[PDB]
Amino acid sequence: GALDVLQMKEEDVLKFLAAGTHLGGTNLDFQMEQYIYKRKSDGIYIINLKRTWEKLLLAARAIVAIENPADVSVISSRNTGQRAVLKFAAATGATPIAGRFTPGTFTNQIQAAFREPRLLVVTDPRADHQPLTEASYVNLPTIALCNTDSPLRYVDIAIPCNNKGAHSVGLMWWMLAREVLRMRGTISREHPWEVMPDLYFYRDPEE
RNA sequence: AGCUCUUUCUCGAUUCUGUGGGUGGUGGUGCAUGGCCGUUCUUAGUUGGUGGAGCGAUUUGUCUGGUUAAUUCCGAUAACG
């Protein structure tokens, strides 16, 4: 949005630059091209950082529009997102799934794990492909974190970022939790937040 | 064998006689059947419900690999129980 109270600050841009979020792959799909700045002299694509903040605020404006927070469902089958989805679902009251998704969880009405959500958020479209294709049987809207070579086939909001691993995946979930809590009125739009980004990251060498 | 022939005593309503109808049968059909037994077959095999795939007969589950006397376990996984 145009508003100064929604503008991206220097201190967020330095946190993007520090985590590698702007660095894509060597390949580009034709659906992702509007999110790209340029290709480097070494064959790597640069993701446009202002495009990310608009698509992340549009995603937060979808998540705030659900009146019961337990109706939102949150997923990661790769390890680099598992700590991050567990912390996101603690900070705001969504339902997490981590590890293997069981086929038929959304469509086998009798099943012990059966559930019926209103919004679905996924960490990587190529890896999390079961809950994406299974959402096509039940009228379920979708948000996803997309790299330059991600296949867009059932996602309704794609957020441009490096999703390969490490600090970049944890930072995106932390920043999405910050803005949903801000615009619902639970924390300040000006005072810094008490939760450090480093709480969401995956398994750097411990000692 | 009073079976039958000659003879002349005996019993007492129980039988005899014609028609209808029964009853019995190690008689016929095991290619009309039940029950029982043998064999395919001594091996590891077989099947619903709800979900997914095909216009359909059908299929997945019931598996690439390792392990076991074993569809026995581990694990993998559009299937779950």
UniProtKB/Swiss-Prot annotation:
Q: Which domain of life is it from?
A: Eukaryota
Region entry Laminin-binding: which residue ranges? 159-178
Q: Name one GO biological process term.
A: translation
GO MF, one term, reads: virus receptor activity
Region annotated Interaction with PPP1R16B, chain positions? 52-111
Family, as annotated: Belongs to the universal ribosomal protein uS2 family.
According to UniProt, the name of this protein is Small ribosomal subunit protein uS2
Native source species = Oryctolagus cuniculus (Rabbit)
Q: What is the lineage of its organism?
A: Eukaryota, Metazoa, Chordata, Craniata, Vertebrata
Q: Which residues of the full protein are shown?
A: 3 to 209 of 295
